């Protein structure tokens, strides 16, 4: 462990905190919280604070339900932005039923359940290394986002330079000051697009860090008079934003994906994991790409994946295996976008990987010949299949897959499906300005 | 004191704080859900570990008393004209007289916590109500239920909103008053609620609320002009 109850009490004592946020994550991935005064810290640490657990369901909630707010001590973080009379600290909390049973509708609890299932298979750790990409948009006088990018930078360019600005540098340093472990940062392909990479860590810790990273990036961008968005494709004709997930499975403290006497230096467990991810790739796309805009990124020509295949060196593969081996052997899933719920996406990815391992599925041959030139029919006879083109198609594929349904349980499944169906129905009946530009004068 | 302090602090921040039951149409209203717990000899009288729902007979009598007079004290718990624009379906505000442990907008809700924290929540009250008068009428109804040992109706856990008003009137589900005038009419005829505030308070409250309703009903709102000035 990192913190105990006495450490938390002493720390809030000297730092003089007055406001504590007991934050959690709902279905849609937005950060929710209930706030208590520091005088209620003892009640909070006793797992006694109650709240309306239906808020996890989002806008599809119906009936009020009382649940407990069991906090995690290791997630204690002091926010650097002092709130006038006193500081603000946060806890990331699990959701529990009034009888002490963990709530089945909590994405974090679902991820913990999937990790328990993984431990039942003999493995010890599931490490994740995220590569979240985001755009920076200038704000106007009224303080609302515009469509102007902060810089005309390029891939790995030294575009922001010195002499002020460089919001990426400030974000990286500030995150370092809060205890984050940042690996590297660079300017992304699209103008005004940036990427910050964290060191790999445990799945729960990685998802918590992803949520905190989104919050901190938005806040710091608001400091600099900028708007930071993790929207998959804010602009047409420009590279989208991905959240490539580097997954590594550990057994007895050693990497289970590495085998020095096997071809590609890959163990049989790694091949089974890749086969499991390939089999269910079209099914968990609804969870890893949960928005309507997510599928405008999944178009050819912008390095985003569009077909179910794995490779070591290819143009926009679904699964990429980095050259590094040994302890750093990992499988990268590039379909995930930053808009996805980290807990749900990790749950479905781990469930697919374990399904591949449990059934000893055979991985297909790697693709190293640029399938893009081949026609859709010219590659359908192979193992290459297309990812869903719309959110509705991905929802249809996700409903049919039995394994992916148990990956998040019946409560999460029904509520996610209802919310996404409402979201798609709202989008499909709208009349966009493009239609008026194309048809109002022509017809 | 909370209302005063909130208004003052919001004024400091260049903001307006209002406890209006429903300042805007099509948007969720503002409630003042009241969690009531009765104690006897320093222990919670609503709790009984050996009974169903872990609820004592005193709690059931209290619920029955609140249910019986619910349509009568609505004029006190919802004393404004705007109060009844909140009491409309679809915004989690109660609209019918029923009690439940888990339902969409029940009049009386019983939280899951038990033991010392056993309580009954009345969700019809809005922040515009006079706290002393609302507490007086709620306590009087609860004591009336306890004193006469009234039998509480069966809890509703099937979403009363599904079926029609005629499809729920045959049950024990009755509708709350739709306007302030209707609530005043219901409140006047309830004998028990009359003593809940005494003759002086009763007459002055009735006079003030009747004047309030008369001023509202004779006004010509801009909605009427938008609906009829050009049509007719």
């Amino acid at each position: 462990a990192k913190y105990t109850r006495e450490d938390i009490e002493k720390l809030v004592k000297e730092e003089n905190v007055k406001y504590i946020r007991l934050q959690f994550t709902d279905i849609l991935g937005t950060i929710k919280n209930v706030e208590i005064p520091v005088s209620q810290l003892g009640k909070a640490l006793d797992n006694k604070v109650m709240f309306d657990g239906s808020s996890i369901e989002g806008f599809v909630r119906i009936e009020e339900s009382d649940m407990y707010l069991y906090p995690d001590l290791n997630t204690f973080v002091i926010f650097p932005w002092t709130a006038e009379k006193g500081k603000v600290a946060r806890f990331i909390c699990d959701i529990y039923n009034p009888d002490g049973t963990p709530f089945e509708g909590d994405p974090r609890n679902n991820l913990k359940r999937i990790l328990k299932e993984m431990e039942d298979l003999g493995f010890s750790d599931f490490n994740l290394g995220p590569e979240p990409e985001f755009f920076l948009f200038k704000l106007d006088e009224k303080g609302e986002p515009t469509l102007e990018l902060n810089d005309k930078g390029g891939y790995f360019d030294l575009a922001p330079t010195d002499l002020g600005e460089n919001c990426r540098r400030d974000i990286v340093l500030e995150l370092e000051e809060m205890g984050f472990e940042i690996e590297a940062s660079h300017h992304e392909v699209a103008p005004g697009q940036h990427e910050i990479d964290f060191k790999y860590a445990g799945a729960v810790r990685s998802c918590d860090d992803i949520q905190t990273f989104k919050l901190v990036v938005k806040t710091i961008a608001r400091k600099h008079g900028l708007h930071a968005t993790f929207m998959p494709k804010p602009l047409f004709g420009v590279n989208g934003s991905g959240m490539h997930c580097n997954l590594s499975l550990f057994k007895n403290g050693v990497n289970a994906f590495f085998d020095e006497n096997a071809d590609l230096q890959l163990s049989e467990t790694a091949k089974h994991f890749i086969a499991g991810i390939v089999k269910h790739a079209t099914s968990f796309t609804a969870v890893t790409n949960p928005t309507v805009n997510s599928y405008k990124r999944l178009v050819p020509g912008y390095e985003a994946p569009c077909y179910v295949a794995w490779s070591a060196q290819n143009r926009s593969p679904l699964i990429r295996i980095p050259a590094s081996r040994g302890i750093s052997t990992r499988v990268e899933v590039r379909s995930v976008d930053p808009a996805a719920n980290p807990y749900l996406a990790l749950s479905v990815l781990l469930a697919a990987g374990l399904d591949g391992i449990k059934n000893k599925l055979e991985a297909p041959a790697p693709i190293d010949r640029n399938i893009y030139v081949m026609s859709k029919e010219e590659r359908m006879e192979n193992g290459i299949v297309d990812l869903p083109a719309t959110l509705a198609e991905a929802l249809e594929e996700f409903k049919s897959n039995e394994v992916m349904v148990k990956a998040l349980g019946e409560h999460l499944f029904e509520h996610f499906i209802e919310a996404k169906e409402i979201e798609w129905d709202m989008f499909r009946t709208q009349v966009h300005p493009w239609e008026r530009e194309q048809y109002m004068s022509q017809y | 004191t909370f209302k005063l302090v909130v208004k003052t602090i919001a004024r400091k921040h260049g903001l307006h704080a209002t406890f209006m039951p429903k300042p805007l149409f099509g948007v969720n209203g503002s409630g003042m859900h009241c969690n009531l717990s009765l104690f006897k000899n320093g222990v919670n009288a609503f709790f009984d570990e050996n009974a169903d729902l872990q609820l004592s007979e005193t709690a059931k009598h209290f619920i029955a008393g609140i249910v019986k007079h619910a349509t009568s004290f609505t004029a006190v718990t919802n004393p404004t004209v705007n109060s009844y624009k909140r009491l409309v379906p679809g915004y989690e505000a109660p609209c019918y007289v029923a009690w439940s442990a888990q339902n969409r907008s029940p009049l009386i809700r019983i939280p899951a916590s038990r033991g010392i924290s056993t309580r009954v929540e009345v969700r019809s009250v809005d922040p515009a109500a006079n706290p002393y008068l609302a507490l007086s009428v709620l306590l009087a109804a609860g004591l009336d239920g306890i004193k006469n040992k009234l039998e509480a109706p069966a809890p509703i856990d099937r979403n009363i909103y599904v079926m029609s008003k005629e499809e729920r009137m045959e049950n024990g589900i009755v509708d709350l008053p739709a306007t302030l005038a209707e609530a005043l009419e219901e409140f006047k005829s309830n004998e028990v609620m009359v003593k809940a505030l005494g003759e002086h308070l009763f007459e002055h409250f009735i006079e003030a609320k009747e004047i309030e309703w008369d001023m509202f009903r004779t006004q010509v709102h801009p909605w009427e002009r938008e609906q009829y000035m050009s049509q007719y």
Partner: peptide, 10 residues
């Protein structure tokens, strides 16, 4: 109807 405040975001 039966759900307007929660779904008002759309």
């Amino acid at each position: 109807t039966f759900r307007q405040g929660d779904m008002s975001r759309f």
